[PDB]
Ligand binder design. Structure first.
Ligand SMILES: CCCCCCCCCCC(CCCCCCCCCC)(CO[C@@H]1O[C@H](CO)[C@@H](O[C@H]2O[C@H](CO)[C@@H](O)[C@H](O)[C@H]2O)[C@H](O)[C@H]1O)CO[C@@H]1O[C@H](CO)[C@@H](O[C@H]2O[C@H](CO)[C@@H](O)[C@H](O)[C@H]2O)[C@H](O)[C@H]1O
Ligand SMILES: CCCCCCCCCCC(CCCCCCCCCC)(CO[C@@H]1O[C@H](CO)[C@@H](O[C@H]2O[C@H](CO)[C@@H](O)[C@H](O)[C@H]2O)[C@H](O)[C@H]1O)CO[C@@H]1O[C@H](CO)[C@@H](O[C@H]2O[C@H](CO)[C@@H](O)[C@H](O)[C@H]2O)[C@H](O)[C@H]1O
Ligand SMILES: CCCCCCCCCCC(CCCCCCCCCC)(CO[C@@H]1O[C@H](CO)[C@@H](O[C@H]2O[C@H](CO)[C@@H](O)[C@H](O)[C@H]2O)[C@H](O)[C@H]1O)CO[C@@H]1O[C@H](CO)[C@@H](O[C@H]2O[C@H](CO)[C@@H](O)[C@H](O)[C@H]2O)[C@H](O)[C@H]1O
Ligand SMILES: CCCCCCCCCCC(CCCCCCCCCC)(CO[C@@H]1O[C@H](CO)[C@@H](O[C@H]2O[C@H](CO)[C@@H](O)[C@H](O)[C@H]2O)[C@H](O)[C@H]1O)CO[C@@H]1O[C@H](CO)[C@@H](O[C@H]2O[C@H](CO)[C@@H](O)[C@H](O)[C@H]2O)[C@H](O)[C@H]1O
Lengths: 181, 55, 181, 181, 181
């Protein structure tokens, strides 16, 4: 991908008056979230449909059972998460030239909402673990089949790490809220 | 009395009730019925003989 | 691809007199439309002809049925959409050097037309859903066969999201129009 | 590829005295011809020999019939077209320092010639369509065979669009020619 | 990947007061650790699941035995190591903008801890060698199987080199520690 556009936009968006906690939040989202997804991410989920095999001869069971097991890959979810979490700080580029604090409050509350929603959706979609077995009973497969997964231990680590980071960021956002009134 | 064209099996090593097909499932039915009839005829004849002869 | 050329051209094209609504429109087209296509797009539609299989032995039944089901991939339609929507703002680089408000009106109306046309074409080509089954009756294939699709749940989300963004942009364009007379 | 070298070279070649029509021509060649080829192009013609299959067991029929059907891919023809059309404007870098309007006339004439020649060559090589069937009668194939094509509806669109752009550019060049004498 | 972001961040993070030993440590981490991973690394571990084959017909033995043999590839462990080791120096930007020595002590301590922990984890996960044979007894494989490995001599070298570099860096960190009290 092209992650330099985001870099320049951000570098132009952080020329804003903030406090200790906002800077800490930016640091955390920048190091433990972006640099991990940009570099270590794309190569793990590149052989996910090619090494996923079921035990049957019926044409059309692998595709169906995959789409039923992993409707959405984790990496795209996390990319979308990053973008939607950074947007409210990008809107400052637009709000500035207009004049050429309230906005702070709005940004804060919206960030709270987005972070909480994404964490909850993460828990409800994927969970805490990725196993190496799935049972599939979707047409055309005949009444049930076993389907096997690839690299099921290198993705659980990602899941757990991301859950932890999201929890920390939620905590920091709530802390910045209580410091407001 | 009949021979179907589908059998579901759950034996080891087969995983969880797989399906299996069959060959010539319509001549064997005919052969079954035919031999059943012949054997029944023989039964009837032997019974009639035994009665005609027995006490 | 090389998305930096577009970046520089735009950065040179936005030095124009606008109003609140134009800036909001630019923000929306830049965040929710470009950054998604650039990053999250190319990797979903990379295995679309390789994992598409039909139930037959006839050579030449997969190519035909593919071309009949997906005549044009979504990602290229959206790229073309982006370029054709951004052009009227690029023509300013030329108008200025030539002159070294009317143009505003022309740009606005043309943007309205292009956006509406592309939304309607999107509804008429693809629809609201991508299913995991297709029935094909095109030569060389025998009268009728079944053909199966890959990742049919990760593209519906894209479709819906893009439909929503297009609707919002149409609304904003009409709003800017009514503010003119 | 590396399309930034061309970008910089051009950015140093357009510091030349021109008129409305030259700037319009540059805009058209830059938007509707370069940005489409850089981004959308390389990915359509990546599986052109791998998904081309003929109905036979003879080793060496697919290669021959391909080379006989598509002797040259469209994308490279268009790249060459772009380069040879932008050349006459690059030679200004060489004439400037040497001089540290006749040249204008020479540029215009050669541009006319190259554009017309390339349009005619496009007409005579490919045509207006790309069908999904070919009949091959070249050694080692036995007297005739049917060979099937991939994505035959996504390339016709490219063909038509490029034909239209070339026609428009020829018209503009002739308009500039009928403006001097 | 995109290793330029890290480059710029670092180039902005090294404008700090240090001593001979900190500069030596930075030099070592930059030359013998980053330039080796960026260039030579990604290409050795690209065919690790495709050339790993076991002696059996059971579907689902290769995936399981791989995940049991290499739960995590070395290259990603080393990337994470690099990032977590460079963090404490990235955290100086925030402190600088805030104030607009103690921090030195904290940074040093945390660097000691992280380096030691990662070296010990390397010892306990992988070891000193990578052999060309593995014995697998995990479901669905029947009671045992031999599984063969790819390029088992080009990775031992990496392991040993990295162990040595880590040892040297630990030594230098302890040396800088004893220099204070
Ligand atoms: C993946 C892409 C991520 C993007 C990363 C880009 C790096 C950002 C660098 C820090 C940064 C952004 C905010 C940092 C928080 C986030 C931490 C990021 C953590 C990531 C690991 C600080 O930003 C500052 O924030 C202040 C907030 O108050 C603000 O002050 C406002 O408050 C008022 C009250 O209303 C308000 O009215 C008013 O408008 C402001 O007065 C400043 O205007 C603003 O510049 C911008 O950097 C600035 O420029 C240089 C380069 O850094 C850096 O060095 C320069 O000065 C040095 C003099 O010695 C010396 O070296 C050189 O002369 C020179 O070189 C500066 O020192 C640094 O200041
Ligand atoms: C992926 C490709 C997208 C590329 C995105 C590029 C980012 C664009 C940045 C904003 C931008 C484009 C328009 C923004 C709308 C779109 C929002 C995009 C949202 C995307 C998330 C504003 O553009 C301005 O628009 C004005 C319109 O009125 C215009 O004013 C005209 O009105 C008259 C009426 O006729 C007209 O006659 C007349 O000619 C003009 O007077 C200005 O000339 C023009 O500069 C250009 O940025 C400008 O330059 C810097 C960098 O931003 C930024 O910081 C600088 O100044 C700061 C002083 O504190 C300070 O920091 C520093 O000194 C310095 O650093 C500037 O503040 C910013 O102004
Ligand atoms: C994929 C790669 C494509 C490359 C794209 C590069 C973009 C080119 C930008 C336009 C461009 C090339 C020509 C444009 C035609 C083609 C349209 C392209 C359409 C594509 C979508 C104009 O070029 C001008 O052409 C003139 C022709 O007469 C020429 O004038 C000659 O005539 C005499 C008679 O002989 C002759 O003697 C004599 O030598 C000249 O007097 C000028 O010297 C020449 O600079 C160069 O841009 C110039 O520099 C800036 C950046 O643009 C731009 O902003 C600057 O000034 C602003 C003051 O407000 C303000 O913002 C800032 O101070 C600053 O920022 C300038 O305004 C712009 O002028
Ligand atoms: C993969 C990405 C890695 C990024 C690599 C980036 C290269 C870094 C270059 C060296 C570097 C970072 C620290 C080096 C240690 C790490 C070695 C790395 C080894 C890697 C192989 C030095 O950094 C200096 O460290 C000093 C520490 O004391 C600090 O001094 C502080 O102490 C006080 C006490 O508190 C403190 O109060 C106060 O704030 C400071 O006074 C300086 O402010 C700081 O600039 C920055 O480079 C600086 O800028 C130029 C470019 O180098 C270089 O050339 C310039 O000057 C030349 C005059 O002839 C001449 O050429 C030119 O005019 C010009 O060009 C400078 O000479 C160089 O100085």
């Amino acid at each position: 991908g092209e992650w330099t556009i985001l870099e320049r936009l951000l570098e132009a968006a952080v020329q804003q008056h903030s406090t200790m906690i906002g800077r800490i939040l930016l640091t955390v989202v920048v190091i433990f979230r972006i640099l991990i997804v940009a570099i270590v991410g794309e190569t793990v989920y590149d052989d996910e449909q090619t090494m996923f095999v079921c035990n049957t001869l019926q044409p059309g069971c692998n595709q169906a059972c995959y789409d039923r097991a992993f409707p959405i890959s984790h990496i795209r979810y996390w990319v979308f998460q990053i973008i939607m979490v950074c947007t409210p700080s990008l809107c400052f580029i637009t709000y500035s030239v207009h004049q050429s604090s309230r906005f702070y409050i709005i940004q804060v509350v919206f960030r709270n909402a987005l972070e909480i929603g994404f964490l909850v959706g993460q828990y409800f979609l994927y969970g805490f673990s990725v196993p190496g077995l799935y049972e599939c009973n979707r047409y055309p497969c005949i009444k049930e089949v076993e389907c096997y997964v690839s690299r099921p231990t290198e993705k659980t680590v990602f899941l757990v790490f991301m859950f932890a980071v999201s929890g920390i960021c939620v905590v920091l956002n709530l802390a910045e809220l209580n410091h407001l009134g | 009395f009949s021979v179907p064209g589908l059998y579901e099996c759950n034996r080891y090593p087969c995983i969880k009730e797989v399906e299996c097909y069959v060959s010539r499932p319509t001549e064997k039915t005919v052969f079954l019925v035919f031999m059943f009839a012949v054997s029944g005829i023989c039964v009837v004849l032997n019974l009639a003989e035994l009665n005609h002869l027995g006490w």
